């Protein structure tokens, strides 16, 4: 039952934004276990994926994935900035992302 | 932070004054540029020596000779207030003259709403004699059998599973 999860958990917090302007081109991601910018240095360049499900069956699957990459840290508390192939929808605020361990650098 | 500097200066020699006198002051400033300006206005207000006709001849940062020995420093300062004039004398126990001055600036900004430009330091002297100490809290620190529990214990990792100890 527990022989899997080669990824770490994350939450899609919000768009990289000012007080009154949002920039959906890059998103803010909070990785579980990461609590500083020096710790976020490890997760820089990793491949983050957003997994959701839909009604219509494409390629015989309900599951669709949107890829992304951690680019830079954000703030002091360990949050990072992520850039995806398709900008994440604004309805996914607080949804769960899966940050994989590749490309590995260690 | 702060560093203690000695600034030695004089006016430019002329025929009237072939050998101008050399004026040295011990003063505290974050960097050499602030120290030179701090000195120049002091020289203006004490001896009326203009900045234009003068020159800074020597600048030297000073390090604490014994930074590893706890000392008591008494500070004579002058304050500009609503009345524009006040005189105070405080005592701080610290191992460095620079730290004592920093503590004095923080205390005065905390109490009398004093800024760096409003405060001018007259003298920072060391008080080795226990009897010469006037402040009771300094004397409290100087007592031989000083002992006390830790004050202000105050203690990302949100959602702690257990209650805090905040004791022994």
């Amino acid at each position: 039952a527990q022989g899997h999860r080669l990824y770490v958990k994350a939450k899609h917090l919000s768009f990289q934004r000012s007080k009154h302007v949002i920039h959906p081109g890059t998103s803010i991601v909070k990785i579980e276990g990461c609590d500083s910018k020096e710790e976020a240095q490890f997760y820089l360049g990793k491949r983050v994926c957003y997994v959701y499900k839909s009604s219509k069956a494409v390629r015989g699957s309900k599951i669709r994935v949107i890829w992304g990459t951690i680019a830079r840290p954000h703030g002091n508390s360990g949050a990072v900035r992520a850039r995806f192939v398709h900008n994440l929808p604004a309805k996914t605020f607080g949804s769960s992302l899966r940050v994989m361990l590749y490309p590995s650098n260690i | 932070a702060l560093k203690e500097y000695q600034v030695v200066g004089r006016k430019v020699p002329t025929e009237h004054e072939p050998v101008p006198k050399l004026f040295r002051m011990r003063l505290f400033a974050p960097n050499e540029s602030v120290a030179k300006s701090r000195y120049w206005y002091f020289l203006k207000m004490i001896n009326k020596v203009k900045k234009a006709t003068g020159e800074i001849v020597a600048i030297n940062e000073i390090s604490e000779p014994k930074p590893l020995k706890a000392k008591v420093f008494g500070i004579w300062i002058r304050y500009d207030s609503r009345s524009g004039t006040h005189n105070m004398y405080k005592e701080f126990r610290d191992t460095t003259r620079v730290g004592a001055v920093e503590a004095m600036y923080a205390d005065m900004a905390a109490r009398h709403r004093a800024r760096f430009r409003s405060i001018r330091i007259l003298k920072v002297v060391e008080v080795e004699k226990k009897e010469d100490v006037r402040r009771n809290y300094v004397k409290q620190l100087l007592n031989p059998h000083l002992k006390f529990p830790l004050p202000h214990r105050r203690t990302k990792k949100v959602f702690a599973p257990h209650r805090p100890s905040t004791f022994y």
């Binding site: 080669l6 770490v8 990461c34 710790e39 590749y102 590995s104 650098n105 | -």
Partner: protein
Amino acid sequence: ENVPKKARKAVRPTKLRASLAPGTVCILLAGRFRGKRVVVLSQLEDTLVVTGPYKVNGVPIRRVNHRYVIATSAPKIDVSGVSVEKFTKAYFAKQKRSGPVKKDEAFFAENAPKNALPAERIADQKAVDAKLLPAIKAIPNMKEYLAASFALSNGDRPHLMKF
């Protein structure tokens, strides 16, 4: 029919990570064999010519990109006793698809290890295993460590743990 400018981009050999020396136990982070532990036979131009002992975890001779590999601090396994020069890019070349007109359940029956896979490839793999098993049998826990699989759990921080 314009002639493109001569690009001044020359090809130079890869500088692999120093930790990926041959004989090191590593975890696959992707592919069909994700989480498995393997022994690095050698370093190719870009990837690692690697295999887990097939008699232990059943991982055949495969290339894996060095960016999808977790290097361990596990003690080195001797590989100097087996040849690695027979593993080339041409050796691993996946011939050519030659048209997508396939996959009518016949390309997939005629696939798998029963067919396609030559008896020669089985011979090198068994030969490599024969030269590798005595080492891992001598040093304790390598057989069991390699048969197991890597996975994360609660309270596990990849940026803190060192492999």
